[PDB]
Ligand binder design. Structure first.
Ligand code: FAD
Ligand SMILES: *[C@@H]1O[C@H](CO)[C@@H](O[C@@H]2O[C@H](CO)[C@@H](O)[C@H](O)[C@H]2NC(C)=O)[C@H](O)[C@H]1NC(C)=O
Ligand code: E2Y
Ligand code: NAG
Ligand code: NAG
Ligand code: NAG
Ligand code: NAG
Ligand code: NAG
Length: 514
């Protein structure tokens, strides 16, 4: 595990403005998106080969509130001016949401919770994983940016609550996604310093890795044995640039659940009838590009203790197969955190509150990413998740809400009631309280008060768009590595999986080429 230490910006020595035309040329690999998967992928490929990493955002030093736990709220409260690290969107379902626009991707703006994948996930996928190498690669990530959290009073209250509510067993401190209650890792260190995927660029070879920032990749270029041969990208001034791969080298899209399918569709990889309807020339028909896009529901209550509670980062997890639960203790604010609640029309907290949360696994409900512009990658795509379209998801939310009621009735949580009465009506709530306990009362609560967990995934799935080598089927020299790749969450908190996956696939590419 990592130690408490400053955020390591050594890598800025090989970070350049995309306005620099001397970056245009031929590389062994081009990685699109300097994010959770892309940064460890590019660093790994750079051990042997010449790599260009292209990121649309700027460097995290421009937005210092991205570098502390205390700055998390600021990034979500900040107005989206096109340049900020948080890009705001609303799904077609009407649920507010965010994605990252910054070198380091979503590991620069996220809640810092670190977990390994459920060890059963690898067999569930039917991919031939090198499991020894998966674990070596988890340790490579953890040694860089993961700490054992110190005790925080509220996380300890919630952990005692989860155990008293029957979320057993007590796993103590563990990075593994296992049934029961545990202290997990964090990418915040014990001084509140954020550590993130950009720091994994410090593991790259500085003679072989180049990083362009404010590089908006608009199009994947193809041969005229269809192969990806390069990219077009625009700089902050609006000027265009090209970069190519050479010989046995490859383009990898790491632009996230939203950005990957967007760029594939803009580049003519996707459903023939849809792309022909936009007069986008089809290079490779695949009816699944932008399909099977998922967002795990977040359902929640907010309690307002009569005495102040200490603000905390999330470190204590209550895991069952059918729901994943945490709680944050949150300082009050008068400017909303965009997407913390599902719409801007949510009450503001006047005092410290506990946000007590359950996540639906999978989920089984899915939707799609479609283009909003047939030409401009800077124009956000349309995204729809179809929350609770699958009844199994709704049943799982009912089970999770019953368990949050159990948590609120524990001796652990009793001291946080406003009134010493028998029920959970003894708490004071911000927003809608929990349930009458008939299925319809819990289903109404689940459906009406859903928010994003921010763990959306899918849109370029293995088994639909990709093979088990993460290659785009029917195309040479093109791969996809990021959260677009799997339909079900690997665990409650997937950044650890996707950090591992960038390096893992980098190591597979290097091996396939030897
Ligand atoms: C608010 C929030 C809180 C979260 N908290 C947690 C948590 O505590 N723990 C956890 O495990 N997970 C958490 N997650 C989820 C997790 O961080 C993400 O699922 C994961 O980081 C996604 O990784 P990715 O590589 O797919 O995408 P990203 O990290 O978003 O990387 C994609 C990158 O591509 C860039 N890009 C996109 N399009 C282009 C383009 N055309 N050209 C160039 N660059 C482009 C983007 O700017 C970005 O930097 C959180 C998510 C959010 C949004
Ligand atoms: C870890 O992943 C495994 C495999 O996906 C899960 O096991 C499955 O769980 C469902 C229960 O909802 C069962 O119907 C399947 O039979 C299980 N598969 C196997 C291989 O046993 C497991 O639930 C996940 N664990 C947690 C804690 O999330
Ligand atoms: C504002 C506040 C309390 O802070 C951080 C936070 C983290 C999580 C986490 O599980 C994820 N992802 C859920 C909710 C949440 O809300
Ligand atoms: C962590 O903060 C403490 C103060 O509580 C200090 O003693 C220690 O040197 C700090 N380490 C850092 C900032 O790296
Ligand atoms: C890149 O250069 C342009 C001016 O050419 C400037 O406006 C922009 O801020 C620079 N971007 C970064 C990320 O340095
Ligand atoms: C990998 O690590 C997990 C714990 O994260 C462990 O349970 C598993 O046995 C390890 N697998 C291999 C192949 O060593
Ligand atoms: C596609 O181009 C044809 C002309 O070739 C035109 O008739 C049609 O309306 C166009 N469709 C779109 C959506 O641009
Ligand atoms: C729910 O999801 C599963 C597929 O994972 C499927 O068997 C079932 O048909 C789905 N229900 C609906 C309404 O789609």
């Amino acid at each position: 595990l990592a130690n408490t230490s400053a955020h390591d910006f050594s890598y800025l020595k090989f970070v350049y403005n995309a306005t620099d035309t001397s970056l245009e040329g031929s590389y062994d690999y081009i990685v699109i998106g300097g994010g959770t998967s892309g940064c460890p992928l590019a660093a790994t490929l750079s051990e042997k080969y010449k790599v260009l990493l292209l990121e649309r955002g700027t460097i995290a030093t421009e937005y210092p509130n991205t570098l502390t736990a205390d700055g998390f709220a600021y990034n979500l409260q900040q107005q989206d001016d096109g340049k900020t690290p948080v890009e705001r969107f609303v799904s077609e379902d009407g649920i507010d949401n965010v994605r990252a626009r910054i070198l380091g991707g979503t590991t620069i703006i996220n809640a810092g919770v670190y977990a390994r994948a459920n060890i059963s996930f690898y067999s569930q996928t039917g991919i031939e994983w090198d499991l020894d190498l998966v674990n070596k690669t988890y340790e490579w990530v953890e040694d860089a940016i993961v700490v054992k959290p110190n005790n925080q009073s509220w996380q300890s209250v919630i952990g005692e609550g989860f155990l008293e509510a029957g979320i057993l067993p007590d796993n103590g401190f563990s990075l593994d996604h296992e049934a029961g209650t545990r202290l997990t890792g964090s990418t915040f260190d014990n001084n509140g310093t954020r550590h993130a995927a950009d720091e994994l660029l410090n593991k790259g070879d500085p003679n072989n890795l180049l990083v362009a920032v404010q590089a908006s990749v608009e199009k994947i270029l193809f041969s005229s044995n269809l192969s990806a041969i390069g990219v077009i990208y625009t700089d902050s001034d609006g000027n265009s640039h090209q970069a190519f791969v050479r010989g046995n080298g490859e383009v990898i899209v790491s632009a996230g659940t939203i950005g990957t399918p967007q760029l594939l569709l803009l580049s003519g990889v996707g459903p023939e009838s849809y792309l022909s309807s936009l007069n986008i020339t089809v290079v490779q028909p695949n009816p699944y590009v932008g399909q099977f896009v998922y967002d795990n529901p977040r359902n929640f209550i907010n309690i307002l203790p009569p005495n102040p509670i200490e603000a905390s980062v999330v470190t204590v997890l209550g895991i069952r197969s059918d729901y994943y639960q945490v709680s944050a203790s949150v300082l009050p604010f008068s400017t909303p955190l965009f997407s913390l609640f599902p719409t801007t029309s949510y009450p503001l907290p006047n005092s410290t509150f506990a946000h007590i949360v359950s996540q639906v696994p999978g989920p089984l409900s899915h939707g799609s990413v479609t283009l909003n512009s047939s030409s401009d990658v800077r124009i956000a795509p349309n995204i729809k998740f179809n929350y609770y379209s699958n009844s199994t998801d709704l049943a799982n939310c009912v089970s999770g809400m019953k368990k949050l009621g159990d948590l609120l009735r524990t001796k652990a949580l009793e001291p946080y009631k406003a009134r010493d009465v028998l029920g959970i009506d003894g708490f004071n709530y911000l927003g809608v309280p929990l349930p009458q306990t008939d299925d319809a009362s819990f289903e109404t609560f689940c459906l009406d008060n859903v928010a994003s967990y921010w763990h959306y995934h899918g849109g370029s799935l293995v088994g639909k768009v990709l093979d088990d080598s993460f290659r785009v089927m029917g195309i040479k020299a093109l791969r996809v590595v990021d959260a677009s790749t799997f339909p079900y969450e690997p665990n409650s908190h997937p950044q650890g999986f996707y950090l591992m996956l960038g390096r893992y696939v980098g190591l597979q590419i290097l091996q396939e080429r030897s």
